[PDB]
Design a protein around this nucleic acid. Sequence first.
RNA 1: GGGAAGUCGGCUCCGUAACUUCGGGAAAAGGGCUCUAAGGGUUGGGCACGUUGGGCUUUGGGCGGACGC
Length: 165
Amino acid sequence: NYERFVTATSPTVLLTTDIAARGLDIPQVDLVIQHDPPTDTKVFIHRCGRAGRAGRRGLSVVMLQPGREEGYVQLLEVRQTPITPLEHPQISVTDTQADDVANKIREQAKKDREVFQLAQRAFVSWARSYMEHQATSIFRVADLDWFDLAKGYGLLELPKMPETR
RNA sequence: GGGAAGUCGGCUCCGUAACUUCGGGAAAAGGGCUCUAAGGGUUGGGCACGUUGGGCUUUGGGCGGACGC
Ligand SMILES: [Mg+2]
């Protein structure tokens, strides 16, 4: 899977964990996107650095949720690194017709049987990784809307995980 | 009865109210993070055509040249 990416002649994209997040000189790389905030802060600086290797203009972008994780920006600011809002493109998000794109993955959740427990197990491991976050003042396991996550991950039904609803 | 009035000279257990042991076990509770090794062995890649031979008839030869009379 690695060897097919380095000699790839197509606009490919890799979905990885923190394996490919440190010291990697992969040539002709431009975009890096953070779905999750890092579980530890030093990983962020190495995570952005997988875009702009020796000149070669690189875009680094991290998605965050509304709430106290908007306060994560000044966490970076005081440490050493400034953070600025995005500049281009300025189009923010597409509305609930993108939910009509987002709910599409719940359709193949019905179609394919194997993706069902794949959907659950991915979601709940995400919850386990949340309370391991070192920023106990920024990311809370209480101040998050589980329905918004379930719509985001396209969960068919919430698992029997210990937050009663 | 008096009280030295003699004479120098008498001094742990029962009932009631809270708390406690041994063993195993680090990481949500009782489908659950990152990375670093290892995480039992064996056997397993599709669909057609013209093509190779044996494999289904047909067409022939000799070898057997028999067996018995
Ligand atoms: Mg390096």
